[PDB]
Design a binder for this molecule. Structure first.
Ligand code: HEC
Ligand code: HEC
Ligand code: HEC
Ligand SMILES: [Cr+3]
Length: 68
């Protein structure tokens, strides 16, 4: 993937793989040999996302992902 996208019922969380890998670097999320990050509604709301945001981009809280 490169620009993973997820259509939600209350907004959207257009993810990024390549566009992100740029700043991230895989390891940023994964750790030696990828596979998955089990995202849905529990982790994506944890360190998963909320962690490497409060610094760049700007909106890290509500509105960040779910385009509001
Ligand atoms: C305001 C603080 C928020 C509301 C309202 C919702 N979120 Fe999020 N969110 C994020 C991700 C990466 C996901 C996983 C994608 C997936 O669903 O597979 C989610 C998911 C949701 C869900 C689940 C949707 C459903 O009912 O199927 C809901 C209801 C939801 N989010 C509401 C990411 C982010 C995030 C990144 C910056 C923020 C700040 C929030 N979500 C905050 C909200
Ligand atoms: C959970 C899978 C994530 C969601 C939801 C979002 N990200 Fe990120 N993110 C990071 C940086 C350094 C930026 C700015 C630079 C860039 O991405 O190249 C972003 C940006 C966003 C955006 C806006 C993208 C844009 O160019 O406008 C959204 C919607 C977004 N992120 C949602 C960093 C990180 C990161 C650090 C390791 C992680 C794990 C994530 N982002 C994950 C999520
Ligand atoms: C660096 C270029 C990489 C590599 C080698 C991998 N990714 Fe990621 N990844 C992230 C998340 C949240 C998931 C799960 C998505 C969800 O369930 O919503 C993934 C998943 C993977 C896979 C498995 C999925 C598949 O494509 O079948 C693989 C093989 C993978 N990744 C490899 C998150 C990030 C991310 C932070 C948002 C960054 C940067 C990357 N991934 C980058 C990489
Ligand atoms: Cr919450």
């Amino acid at each position: 993937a490169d620009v993973v996208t997820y259509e939600n019922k209350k907004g959207n969380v257009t993810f990024d793989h390549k566009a992100h890998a740029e700043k991230l670097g895989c390891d940023a999320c994964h750790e030696g040999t990828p596979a998955k990050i089990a995202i849905d509604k529990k982790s994506a709301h944890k360190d998963a996302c909320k962690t490497c945001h409060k610094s760049n981009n700007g909106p890290t809280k509500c509105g960040g992902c779910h385009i509001k």
